[PDB]
Design a protein around this ligand. Structure first.
Ligand SMILES: COc1cc([C@@H]2c3cc4c(cc3[C@@H](O[C@@H]3O[C@@H]5CO[C@@H](C)O[C@H]5[C@H](O)[C@H]3O)[C@H]3COC(=O)[C@H]23)OCO4)cc(OC)c1O
Ligand SMILES: COc1cc([C@@H]2c3cc4c(cc3[C@@H](O[C@@H]3O[C@@H]5CO[C@@H](C)O[C@H]5[C@H](O)[C@H]3O)[C@H]3COC(=O)[C@H]23)OCO4)cc(OC)c1O
Ligand SMILES: [Mg+2]
Ligand SMILES: [Mg+2]
Ligand SMILES: [Mg+2]
Ligand SMILES: [Mg+2]
Ligand SMILES: [Mg+2]
Ligand SMILES: [Mg+2]
Lengths: 724, 724
DNA sequence: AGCCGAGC
DNA sequence: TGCAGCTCGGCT
DNA sequence: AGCCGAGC
DNA sequence: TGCAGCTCGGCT
């Protein structure tokens, strides 16, 4: 009736107005899918309107924000809803243009969140409408299987997994994952609406417990409630896993009604947990799942030259089975690369291009399609390649992907800090000096006491003092030049240059009466320098009061919510950063033991293989073995009867979960019969034998010291080049 | 005063209004660079406003379009310009808010076109203003070099190339290309405006010859002029190339004034030529530079699975040195993939997703980030891999890229047609049947006369008759069902279904008096079916008049401007499609000769290498050669004394522009001393020898017939699967 | 007076 | 090409 | 009462 | 994430 992107129903606003249905979809792509499915007949009774992502939570939202929201204003106009109107009587429902609203989103956790926000909107503004079976949802499959011309659909991952357990020949079926509504074709869309019984679920009001559930999820007043709520979920799911029990799921059979209580505690709770899993980092590598996928990809690619952020994002997506919008990966990549004051002490990705500055706090970054990046030379030193063999890599989309966590040589979570916002919890950890952390590691390794650590930011000329535990004061730098002039040499951490000029200095220049007379900017892209001119009286006043206080060069930093995932996926709340450092130390020391154990096995096999290859060559030259014009099968019998071992590297690798293999012996070129290459082979076997023996007489701590030494050397070199 | 994206000057609209300067920039990214450059103390006198791409040509534009143009209305409001006002007197110039307009665009050909469009705007509306030195331009470098701490800038590619000629050690310097204003940093931006003298060029009126130059470039009445204008440029530049002479350029030294005549004939002409080069396809492969880069990339990648169009575009850009917006590449990729009626007879890229239909003529395509594509199975058959070794690959950005043209087995330009719009010329070539083209090729190869070819479109049920040469009539299909009902089974080529419904049937239903009573749609995604209800009198009337005429199911097709680039980069205008077919035949036949010659060399070398390797093994087994524990130098002497040839493949590779190399002999594994592998080696030697002998007894025409045969077979298989 | 396509 | 909405929790 | 970041 | 302006020449 005057709104774009709207495919309004034809029978909307007549006698049969209550017999119409409005389909709210997850985006415009979803709108197209719904439209194709609903045709050709049914345009009269069914309407479609796309929602541009997640909508507004209006339960504690201000009056200004709610009225100035375009999304909900469109919905109100289309449906014909009226603000603060009671719909208890069956006559008030006749006023609306549509009878029922069917929410059709993705079959992912985010889709569930969208449904919840819509429900929250209706429940808060019109509680009467919710008790009249006004809301429903259109569900679409997420996994499909077919062997011949028969087809089966699943509507949840637990359902699909349970099917593979019951069905023996599950590998004889095609497997098609549905990332979203966009995956489904127009033809498949028609088949969906043809079987409306299966894909239609009606929301049912059962009592006050529903209101309690809805309020639980979307009230800012009930945060502690959601904490216990999710704590129970995490613990129970953990126990189900320990007892070897499958997760419960919905939409297994055809269901008519769905309680709001059940919806919140069986579907929406899945989102809130996944939100915490993707927003709150792990203590081990300080990475989130999204970030870790990027790092895993860059490690797998091993690019020697720069790569577009946009291009890299796509690579990460396909190689790490990333099932979200690529824009998020791009923003993550940019964030990981930033290295201005207040961001990262040790950026894992190189910011090659305009990734933002301290001027606008990174917001001045260029388009991801116009900037380049690659691994920092410190990345594979912080996360040594040798440790990859002791990690547990996840499986998704029929391929191996990122591990549950990487195991860096120093607690990375303390280096670039940690910021994240989920449901129930949120994480906030300040940055710390790398060299200082390395030192504390060495002290803990020497059985000494770890020194207390103050938050330290790279290239920050200011100071950071501690008052109460986990409560700090960050101060910039100011200096007196004369009776009328002062110099501001540093702003406090995360206090950006442009914002400071607009929010602090410009008010001081104008109007409360003016304080400063004039100011000049001498900023570089990495440093801050303000020169301020004042009267002699004004400066004398500010001097006794406190220059830092007057010019707002002090910011407070309270970090009590240091919430992280431990090495087993449990949400721990760490009290001090030394707790994090200690727990990390235990785990890291253990995995150095594990690395040595693995390396012993590998180097052992490799030495054994070299032993066989050397013996084979020498016996051939001595004439103890004839292979010229000899058949393969006969020659194999010869080797076995002469006691030659099967491929040790192959045999050892297979032990990490066709007859004997002697290919590695004959795969050797004719070169290794020459004198120069024979000596080289005998040299390599002795050298490799030596490496194994050298490793045996080294403690895990010794190996750790090696990595730390190698890291520090390059760290100095890198930061030196930075200063230059 | 009410316009967004505007950083208006502070002294605008005062006494010093004529002392102000307005900077019109190429986009918003350019605005940021200007803003950064004028800082930190330079402001008040300088204003910045971004132009959203190329603006409107107002020389022959309608009154409605000019007044309803947002771009020019903003400039007029900001500067304070008045329509049809004389500015000869020095008092009228005080009325404006700005004194001078400085145009700051990229240093590319497109930027030049923008400057030209601005000049055209001013010259046409206010000729008096042009004679007062009102317009100027801000120029930025395109290439920078630096060896130590000294830096040099170039403002044109010919200047940089001339510099590399004059400077011996040009490789000891860093080379930084500037794709656009976005490439320059904030620091470099500041350095540009700091040296205002160098980067400021004032436009100067010299006489009536300037008006003639401006009119030449932007008047629709002077098209034939631009043909000769560009004809002279192409011929002169061609001769300069043949004589080894450098191109002329501007901005070598610091210049104060620049005449409009020189600007048109030395800068804008570069654009118009580049426009023709990127819009008009080559006769050889029927591809444009943009399209060819996509195909070259897809050939290099050899993807076995689908790829996002967005993702692929980025891949093409970096791998083929593409220096334009990736969106152009995305639209190009989509265009190459389309396969509905009226588009491509043989799409080189598979349209996996919504690439558009005949319903809305391809405009209904989905987002490039949500659709996939890959090479058609016919692609590497049309463009045989064996021909890649005879092509001339271009060099750009220090890497190899697409060739000047590919050499397909059949004239691809005639298959999917050819559409392009440049300056002076424009291309329009209809589609032709593949099999008919294959046949005429075979006829020309058999020494017969080529048969005349009518335009043929794939899956087109209609008819195409020829009236005058290069003038055709395309007719749809209509049938009489009864006295009141007719069936429209096909619309003429490129007459879209939705457009036909709105522009033909709907007027017939309403209001001139109504003709039809009712109509129904029975369309699929690939076919058209209209059923129309009329009175017996109306149908009888339309029947005698002509149903095709009445329902406008006939469209005319005149193709006189069949303009293409020949095999040497000269713009030729072909009269008939048989001329294109004939010229192609000569070139293709020549290159089949070239292919055989190259293959003879390669296969010869490969056979020689296999001969030596086979002989070496047999002599070793027979005991004619001892290599066990023998020194390298001694063993080399043995081989040379036994007449063993040096590495033939290596020798042959090097011929395509210390001492004998026998590595290939000893590089062979010990396996090849065994019976099974010895027989394997001897078979390959015989097989390669056979392949060489087989090639020898084949004419170039014989090889061509082979490719055509292999192509036709797969063509049948593909098109069969399509119909199913 | 609008379509066709590679560009800003 | 640049442009815009919202979530979720803790803190100034 | 607005920032921080991975998501729609 | 989807959205919008214009060029250039030949033809209906
Ligand atoms: C009507 O088009 C649709 C829009 C959306 C939203 C959206 C919605 C907006 C809005 C902006 C956005 C936008 O996020 C902006 O995008 C930027 C993308 O690049 C990075 C660098 O930075 C991001 C911004 O932080 C974010 O502000 C979208 C990107 O991916 C989405 O999911 C976003 O401003 C006004 O309302 C979803 C849909 O269907 C699910 C749609 O059909
Ligand atoms: C935002 O501000 C700027 C805009 C531009 C233009 C542009 C200008 C427009 C306009 C749209 C566009 C747009 O093209 C649209 O994009 C689409 C994107 O890809 C495919 C899918 O299809 C393309 C459309 O055919 C085209 O309609 C731009 C894409 O790349 C450009 O060069 C385009 O509508 C109104 O005016 C240049 C600048 O600096 C040089 C700017 O700062
Ligand atoms: Mg989704
Ligand atoms: Mg950070
Ligand atoms: Mg450009
Ligand atoms: Mg075409
Ligand atoms: Mg909030
Ligand atoms: Mg025109």
């Amino acid at each position: 009736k005057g709104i774009p992107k709207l495919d309004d129903a034809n029978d909307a606003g007549g006698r049969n107005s209550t017999e119409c249905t409005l389909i709210l979809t997850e985006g415009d792509s979803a709108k197209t899918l719904a439209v194709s499915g609903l045709g050709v007949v049914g345009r009269d009774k069914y309407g479609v309107f796309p929602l541009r992502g997640k909508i507004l939570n209006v339960r504690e939202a201000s009056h200004k924000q709610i009225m100035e929201n375009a999304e909900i204003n469109n919905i109100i106009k289309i449906v014909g809803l009226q603000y603060k109107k009671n719909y208890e009587d069956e006559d008030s429902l006749k006023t609306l243009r549509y009878g029922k609203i069917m929410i059709m989103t993705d079959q992912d956790q985010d889709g569930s969140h969208i449904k919840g926000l819509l429900i929250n909107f209706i429940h808060h503004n019109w509680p009467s409408l919710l008790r009249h079976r006004f809301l429903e949802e259109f569900i679409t499959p997420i996994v499909k299987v077919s062997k011949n011309k028969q087809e089966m659909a699943f509507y949840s991952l637990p359902e699909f997994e349970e099917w593979k357990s019951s069905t023996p020949n599950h590998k004889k079926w095609k497997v098609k994952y549905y990332k979203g509504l966009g995956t489904s074709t127009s033809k498949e869309a028609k088949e969906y609406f043809a079987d409306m019984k299966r894909h239609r679920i009606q929301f049912k009001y059962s009592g006050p417990e529903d209101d309690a559930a809805i309020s639980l999820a979307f009230s800012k007043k009930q945060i502690d409630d959601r904490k216990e709520w999710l704590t129970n979920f995490m613990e129970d799911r953990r126990q189900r896993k320990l007892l070897g029990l499958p997760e419960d799921y919905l939409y297994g059979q055809t269901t008519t009604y769905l309680t709001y209580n059940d919806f919140i505690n069986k579907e929406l709770i899945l989102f809130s947990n996944s939100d915490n899993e993707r927003s709150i980092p792990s203590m081990v590598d300080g990475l989130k799942p999204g970030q870790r996928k990027v790092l895993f990809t860059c490690f797998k690619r091993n690019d020697k030259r720069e790569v577009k952020v946009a291009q890299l994002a796509g690579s990460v997506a396909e190689m790490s089975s990333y099932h979200h919008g690529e824009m998020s990966l791009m923003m993550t990549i940019i964030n990981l690369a930033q290295n201005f004051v207040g961001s990262n002490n040790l950026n894992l990705l190189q910011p090659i291009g305009q990734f933002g500055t301290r001027l606008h706090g990174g917001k001045d970054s260029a388009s991801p399609r116009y900037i380049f990046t690659m691994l920092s030379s410190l990345a594979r030193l912080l996360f040594p390649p040798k440790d990859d063999h002791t990690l547990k890599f996840l499986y998704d989309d029929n391929q191996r992907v990122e591990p549950e966590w990487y195991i860096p040589i120093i607690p990375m979570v303390l280096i670039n800090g940690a910021e994240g916002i989920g449901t129930g919890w949120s994480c906030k950890i300040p940055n710390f000096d790398v060299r200082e952390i390395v030192n504390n590691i060495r002290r803990l390794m020497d059985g000494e006491e770890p020194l207390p650590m103050l938050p330290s930011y790279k290239n920050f000329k200011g100071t950071i003092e501690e008052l109460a535990p986990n409560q700090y004061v960050i101060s910039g730098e100011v200096a007196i030049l004369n009776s009328t002039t002062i110099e501001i040499s540093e702003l406090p951490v995360r206090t950006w240059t442009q914002t400071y000029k607009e929010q602090v200095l410009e008010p001081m220049l104008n109007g409360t009466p003016p304080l400063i007379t004039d100011y000049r900017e001498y900023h570089t892209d990495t440093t801050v320098k303000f020169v301020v001119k004042m009267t002699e009286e004004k400066l004398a006043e500010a001097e006794r009061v406190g220059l830092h206080k007057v010019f707002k060069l002090q910011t407070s930093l309270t970090c009590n919510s240091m919430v992280l995932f431990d090495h087993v996926g449990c949400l721990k709340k760490y009290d001090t950063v030394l707790d994090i450092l200690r727990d990390f130390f235990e785990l890291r020391l253990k995995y150095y033991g594990l690395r040595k154990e693995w390396l012993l096995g590998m180097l052992g096999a490799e030495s054994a293989k070299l032993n066989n290859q050397a013996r084979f060559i020498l016996e051939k030259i001595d004439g103890k073995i004839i292979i010229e014009n000899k058949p393969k099968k006969e020659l194999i019998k010869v080797l076995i009867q002469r006691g030659y071992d099967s491929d040790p590297v192959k045999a050892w690798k297979e032990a990490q979960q066709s007859g004997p293999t002697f290919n590695y012996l004959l795969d050797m070129p004719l070169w290794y019969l020459t004198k120069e290459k024979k000596d080289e082979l005998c040299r390599l076997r002795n050298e490799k034998e030596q490496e194994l023996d050298t490793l045996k007489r080294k403690s895990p701590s010794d190996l750790w010291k090696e990595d730390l030494a190698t890291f520090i050397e390059e760290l100095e070199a890198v930061e030196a080049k930075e200063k230059q």
